[PDB]
Design a protein around this ligand. Structure first.
Ligand SMILES: [Zn+2]
Ligand SMILES: [Zn+2]
Ligand SMILES: [Zn+2]
Ligand SMILES: [Zn+2]
Lengths: 62, 57
């Protein structure tokens, strides 16, 4: 997990607000509550189990 | 050898159940849902889970 300070979501156009990159699908995670895309690389605690990755809840919703 | 996906309604064609989101995995190429519980080899990394290719792909 990259972010040691505050974590930022994605653009809505698909750009990570933190690292200024457009994450590929293998690096993208959308929340199960607000459905906001997040760059999984720039998270503080990326999901570590398969179930946590499926029903993933973003840091703003957790 | 007999890996079966989910129907349009959602009932898994290998266990006759409607899996929850914590047990549903949609393929990144043919956008077909699958029941991970009925999968022979579930994904092993985070990248293979985020962009998942179903057995038939
Ligand atoms: Zn990023
Ligand atoms: Zn959320
Ligand atoms: Zn099943
Ligand atoms: Zn497929």
């Amino acid at each position: 997990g990259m972010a040691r300070d505050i974590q930022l979501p994605c653009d809505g156009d698909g750009v990570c607000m933190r690292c200024k990159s457009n994450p590929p699908p293998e690096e993208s995670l959308t929340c199960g509550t607000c459905v906001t895309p997040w760059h999984v690389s720039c998270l503080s605690s990326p999901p570590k189990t398969l179930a946590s990755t499926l029903q993933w809840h973003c840091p703003d919703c957790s």
